[PDB]
Design a protein around this nucleic acid. Sequence first.
DNA 1: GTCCCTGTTCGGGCGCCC
DNA 2: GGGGGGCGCCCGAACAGGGACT
Lengths: 548, 398
Amino acid sequence: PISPIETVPVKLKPGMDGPKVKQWPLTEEKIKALVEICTEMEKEGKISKIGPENPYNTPVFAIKKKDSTKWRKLVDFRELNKRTQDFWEVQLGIPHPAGLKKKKSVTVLDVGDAYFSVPLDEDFRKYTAFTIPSIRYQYNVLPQGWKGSPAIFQSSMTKILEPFRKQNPDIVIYQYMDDLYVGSDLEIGQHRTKIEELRQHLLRWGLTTPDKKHQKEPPFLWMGYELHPDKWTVQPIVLPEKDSWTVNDICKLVGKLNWASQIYPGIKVRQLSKLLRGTKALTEVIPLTEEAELELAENREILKEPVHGVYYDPSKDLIAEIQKQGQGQWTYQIYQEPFKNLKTGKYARMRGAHTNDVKQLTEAVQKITTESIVIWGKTPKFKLPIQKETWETWWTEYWQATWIPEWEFVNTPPLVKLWYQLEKEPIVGAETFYVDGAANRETKLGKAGYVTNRGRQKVVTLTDTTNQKTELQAIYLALQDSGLEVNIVTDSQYALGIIQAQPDQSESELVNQIIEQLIKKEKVYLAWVPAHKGIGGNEQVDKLVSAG
Amino acid sequence: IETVPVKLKPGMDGPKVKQWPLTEEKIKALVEICTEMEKEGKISKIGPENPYNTPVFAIKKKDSTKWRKLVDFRELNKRTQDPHPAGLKKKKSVTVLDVGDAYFSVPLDEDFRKYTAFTIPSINNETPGIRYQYNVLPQGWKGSPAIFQSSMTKILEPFRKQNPDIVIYQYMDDLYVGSDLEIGQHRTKIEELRQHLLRWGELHPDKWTVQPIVLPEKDSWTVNDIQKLVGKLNWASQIYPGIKVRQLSKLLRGTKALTEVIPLTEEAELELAENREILKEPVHGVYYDPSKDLIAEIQKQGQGQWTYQIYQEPFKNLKTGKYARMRGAHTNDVKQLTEAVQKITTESIVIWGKTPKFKLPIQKETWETWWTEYWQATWIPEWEFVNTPPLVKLWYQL
DNA sequence: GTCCCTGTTCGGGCGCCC
DNA sequence: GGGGGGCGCCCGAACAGGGACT
Ligand SMILES: Nc1nc(=O)n([C@@H]2CS[C@H](COP(=O)(O)OP(=O)(O)OP(=O)(O)O)O2)cc1F
C-alpha cells in the first residue's frame, strides 16, 4: 500500500525544465516484465496514465534481482537528476557488524516494495513521465533511478520509526535503506511480541514486511555478512583467475581485496596498485610485474584460511595492534580479548613526496582512531612496534606538533625506527663541505659542486636539470666524497627542509640515493647560510657552479 | 516579536560542510540537548530537501556534568551579509561570561532558517542523520550579537551607569568584563552582573609578555656560531631595517672548518652591540587595519615552549609572544597547541575585537582528529595548516 | 612576473550494501 | 547491458602557495 506520510517538497533547479528523451528499444522479455509490473502499479495508484498534457519522457528498463525470479524496474533519470535540486544526504556511512553488541534475541526484516510505498510530491510527478512500448505513465511514488529517492526514503523511514524508537528505547534497530536489524535483551517470546508491534507500526504507515524476507533464526544474512550468535563472518570472497589482466580486471581485484581486509589480516595491494598508473582506459591490458605477481599469490593464500570476527563488549577495552608490512604498508587488528579480533584493516596511503616510517605510523594511528570513533564511538588503546625512546627522539627533533594516544610497545618486528640522525652541533675533525648548485632556466643545463676547508674542490655538470635538483645534487656529491663524518653547509632552504625531516623513502631517485649515504655515515651535520651574501666559502663555491 | 530580515553576501550560497564523526559521549549530549531545544520551539526537524549543512559537536566544561553544544558556523559567518574599547586591554582583571543563552529569545528570520541546518550522527551508523534547523538566534552565528545588540544595550545599561569604570564588552556569545578591583571585589562585582542578567532572562590583560628577538652572548665564537648568527640577523633585518651584518660576515672570509674559533674584531664586536639594541626598540610603523584579517603564526620551540606572531602584512608584526607549559611525560603537543590558539584568539578579541586566521604547524589530519577534545571556547577561529620552514624555528628561539 | 616543487580537493574508475 | 544514494580504495588533473631567479 502507499504510506499516508507527507511527501517531501522538491523542485527542479532554477530556469530548468523537465526531460524530453526518446524511449529506447527493449527486449521482448523485458517488455513483458515491464507491463506485468506496470499494470499492477497503475492498479494500486502507484502510477497514472498520462496524456498529451505531458511533454516529458525518460527511458526505462529492468534487470533481474538476487532472487533471480523477480524483475527490478529502473529509470535512466540521468537527465532529470542533473536538473533536480541538491539534497543533503542523510546516510553518513555504513554500519559494521563489529560495532554490534551481544544480543539475546535478534531479527532481520526487509520492507516489501519499499520505494513504491512512499508517495512522490504532486508538483513533481509530471517530470517522471515514461513510456512502456509494446502506454504512457507517470510516477506517484518514488522511482528507482532518481537521485532524490534514497535520501527521501531514508528520511521518511526515520520519521516513521521515531515514535517506535521513543516508545521502545531499548530495542535496537539498525536501519539501512529498507533493511532492519532488530535486537533486544528479551526472552524469545517477549521479543517476538515486540517484533509484531514493530511490524504493525510499519503497516500502519503503509510499509509491509513480507514473511518471505523475515529471518527468525541464526545465522542472519545482513549487509553482506552472516551473523552467528557469538561470531560473524563475511560471505565468501572469490578472486578472478584471468591470465591476462586489464585495468578493469585489476581495479576489480583491488576492491575485493580492500573489502576482504576488514577481517582478513595481512592483505597487501601496493604492487597491484602500482600497475594502475598511466593507464588511460579501463580496457587497457597490463602485464603483472614480478613482485605484483608474487603479491597476488600471498593474498590468495590468505583468503584460503578460515576467519571470523566477534561482537563488541563495552565493559572491556578497545585495543588496536599495528604491524609494519614494508614499503609504506600497514596491517592492524582491533580487539578486546587476545586472538579474538573485532575486525582488521590496512593503511597503505603514500602521502608526501618524501616521508619516513614514524610519520606513516602516525598516519595509521590517526586513521584507525577516526574509524574506531565511527564504529564504537571511542578511541582504542594502541600496541605499536616502536620503542618509547624512538618516538621520544622523533617528537623531540621534529619541528611539528605530533602525537599518538595511549600506547604500549610490542616487540613484533619489523620494528619502526629512525635510520639516521643528524647532529645538533657541528663535528670536530670532520671535513667541512660548502656545496652549491645553479641552473639555466632556458637551456636546462647546470652545475653542482663543493669546496672544502682542506682545499678540495669538485664541480659536476648536468643536463635537463633544475635549481632544486642541482642543490640536491651538490649535497649527494659531498656525501659521496666525504668520510664517515662530514659537515655540510648549504644555502638551499628547499634541500635543508627535506633532509632535516629524516626521510627514509622518496618518490625521487635522487633523494633515495642521498638517503642511502646518510644511512652509511656515522655523523652528518647540515647547516644553512643565506646565499649571495659573501659568506665564504659559500662565496667560493658559488663562483664555481656559476658558469651559467 | 517581528524578525529582522537577513541576507547572504551577494553571489554566495549557504554552507554545505559534512558533519564529522563524534564520540558516544558527545552524541548522547547533543541528542539530549537537541530534544529539549526541540521541546521549546528553538529548533525544528527538517528533511534532506534542505541542501544546506554545518558541522556540530559538544564540549564538557571544566569540572562539570554539563555539556555545551557548539555549532561550527565559521563557513556560514563568512557568507553572511556584514565599537571595540581600547580600554579593555588595560585592566588588572578581566572576566569572561557566556551570554549565549540570551539569543534563544529572539526569533530568526524565516527565510534565513534553512541556512542554519545541522545533522546529528549515530554510533556505527545505526541510523541516517537527524537533521535540525534553527528557529531563533543560534549561538556562534555572527548575526546573533548584531541583531541582539539593541536589547543587550538596555540590559547592561544601568549596571554600567552604576559602575561606570567597569568596562563590559561583547564578542559573539561572550561578555568581557574588566575592572581594577582587587580580586574578591572584582568577583563580587561579577556575580552582581550575573544576578542582574538572570533578572532579564579569569584574565589579566595588563601582564601579557612581549617576546623580543635576542642574540647569543659568548666568550668563544666558532665559525659555526657566527654563520648561524649572521643568517638569523639577515632575516631579522626584514623586520628591523636597522640590523647590520657586514663586519661579522667579514670574519667568515675564506673557507674554514665549522668548529674553528674566531676572535671577534672590535668592529664586529661593535656592530654586535648595535644590533643587540636595534632589537630592543619597538617595531616602527604598523597600523591595525580591520579591512584585513589578523594572521597568526605558531612555532613549536620544544620543551613545551611555543612562539607566535600576530601580523596582517608579512614582517609587520602587530604582536609577538610566547606560550610556555609543562615539561615531562604526559606532554601532548596537540593539546598544548589548541591551548595556544585559544590563548591567542582570546588576546586578539581583547586587543582588536577580532579573530585571527591561524597558520598551524601540524598535519591537517592530526589536528582534525583531536582538537575538539581540548576545546573550551564558544567561538572557533579560522585556520589553515602549514609545514613551517625549519629556519623560522630558530629565529624566534629563546 | 616565471618556473619549480609540494600539498590539497575533487572527480573518475572499481569494491561492498540496499 | 544502459539507473540511484552511501562508505572504502587508488589514481591523475586541477589549482594554491612558497622559494629562487630575470
Ligand atoms: N540496486 C538497487 N537499487 C535500488 O535503487 N534499490 C532501492 C534501494 S533499497 C530499495 C528496495 O530494496 P529491496 O532490495 O528490499 O527491494 P524492494 O523493496 O524493491 O522489493 P522487495 O523488498 O524485494 O519486496 O530499492 C535497491 C537496489 F538493490
